[PDB]
């Protein structure tokens, strides 16, 4: 019955619409059905085996939507209703700015990907900041509840100092943020990449966290650094060194790729932009096992990339992500995928011998 609705949207009214729709009026309204609650509520109740305490919280299940979807926080509480255990919103950067010009967003469905050149379209920092403030006590009573906040931030395509527009970011929507995101790897904005440099990045995190620390203290949120699985291995040496000489307080792995896999069948394959979706899964999975690794287990991992099965999210788990999130494959099987993802995990717990995700935290690393 719920396999069920999920053949329904994955077979034929995704297909369909998607035949229908270009993806960004897709997207649009995708996140405006969502925001109006349109969509049913998520019949999968949660159990117990899926939740995980970390970055000073508690998230009822594991599974989140990743950044982008929600790029100017309008869908939050409809995400939650989906069945999301957290919701990123952003990148938001701090002034308004329109991104790149169309057409800028390719499917490849052969490949179960997609390619995306948005460059941080957002409303700004002051829209999402009065946004986010009229629903503040109610995320209050989510968060409680077990269903967490993040934001993510990104930074202006003028903008001189990378660094004050990640500052400005910190002080408008850290204290709304359960955790903020330092978005530094963004595929879609000249020399953005190079911050994740290791003296560009630790420049920038002290920054990020003298800002942070100022914040009052029921107002104070974790700070992660979102990586690109593109960096080579002393980029990723140098990124886990920042992390623990700072007290970084988690890392999101990975964003999209400027690689293109040798058997991208899609006719949009060389389209300039960042891969999403299957052909980037193990690759961000690998990422993760290595990040983990350099940090001792001890740095909280959200992985991401690639992510439409129990499986895929196990398999990160595994390789030492604490949560997970999606976006592409709730592109192309819709929302019944979210509920998919969370039973089938939690019949893989089960079927593997672990009490519950807690105990599946880099258990590859412990074999
Ligand atoms: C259309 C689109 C827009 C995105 N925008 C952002 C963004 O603004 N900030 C960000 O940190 N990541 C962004 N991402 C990356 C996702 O958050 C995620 O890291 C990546 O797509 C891999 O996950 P997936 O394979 O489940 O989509 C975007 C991805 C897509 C496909
Ligand atoms: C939240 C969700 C995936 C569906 C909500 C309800 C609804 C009526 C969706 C209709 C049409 C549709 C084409 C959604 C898929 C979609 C895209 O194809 C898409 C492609 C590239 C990047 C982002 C995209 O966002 C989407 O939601
Ligand atoms: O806005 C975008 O172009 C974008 C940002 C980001 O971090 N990742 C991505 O794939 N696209």
């Known amino acids: 019955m719920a396999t069920g609705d999920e053949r329904f949207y994955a077979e034929h009214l995704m297909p369909t619409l998607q035949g229908l729709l270009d993806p960004e009026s897709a997207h649009r309204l995708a996140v405006r059905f969502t925001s109006l609650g349109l969509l049913p509520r998520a019949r999968f ?8 305490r970390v970055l000073g919280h508690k998230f009822r299940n594991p599974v989140g939507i990743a950044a982008g979807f929600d790029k100017h926080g309008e869908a939050v509480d409809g995400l939650y209703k989906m069945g999301f255990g957290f919701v990123e919103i952003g990148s938001v950067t701090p002034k308004p700015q329109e991104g790149n010009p169309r057409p800028r967003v390719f499917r490849l469905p052969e490949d179960q990907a997609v390619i ?9 920092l002051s ?3 009065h ?19 993040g934001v993510n931030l990104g930074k202006n395509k003028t903008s001189v100092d990378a660094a004050e527009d990640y500052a400005e970011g910190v002080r408008v929507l850290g204290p709304l943020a359960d955790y903020l995101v330092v978005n530094v790897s963004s595929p879609n904005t000249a020399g953005l990449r190079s911050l994740q440099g290791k003296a560009e990045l630790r420049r920038l995190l002290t920054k990020v966290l003298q800002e942070r620390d100022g914040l009052r203290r029921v107002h104070r949120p974790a700070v992660l650094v979102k990586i690109a699985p593109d ?6 040496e140098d990124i886990a060194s920042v992390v623990k000489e700072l ?4 890392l999101i792995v990975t964003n999209t790729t400027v690689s293109r896999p040798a058997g991208l069948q899609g006719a949009l394959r060389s389209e300039t932009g960042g891969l999403s979706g299957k052909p980037l899964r193990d690759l961000s999975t690998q990422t993760i096992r290595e990040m983990y ?22 398999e990160k788990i595994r390789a030492g992500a604490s949560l997970v999130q999606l976006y592409t494959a709730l592109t192309f099987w819709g929302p019944p995928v979210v509920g998919k993802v969370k039973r ?5 717990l089960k079927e593997q011998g672990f009490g519950g995700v807690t105990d599946a935290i880099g258990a590859d690393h412990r074999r």
């Open 116 to 124: 995306n050149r948005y460059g941080f379209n957002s409303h700004g």
């Open 247 to 250: 007290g970084i307080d988690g």
């Open 231 to 236: 960096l080579t291995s002393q980029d990723k």
């Open 45 to 52: 109740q949660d159990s117990d085996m899926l939740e995980v």
């Open 344 to 348: 089938e995990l939690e019949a893989l």
């Open 127 to 129: 829209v999402v900041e």
């Open 293 to 314: 690794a350099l940090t001792q287990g001890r740095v909280p991992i959200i992985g991401v990339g690639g992510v439409s099965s129990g499986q895929d999210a196990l």
């Open 131 to 149: 946004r986010l403030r009229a629903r503040q006590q109610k995320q209050a009573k989510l968060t409680e509840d077990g269903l967490p906040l």
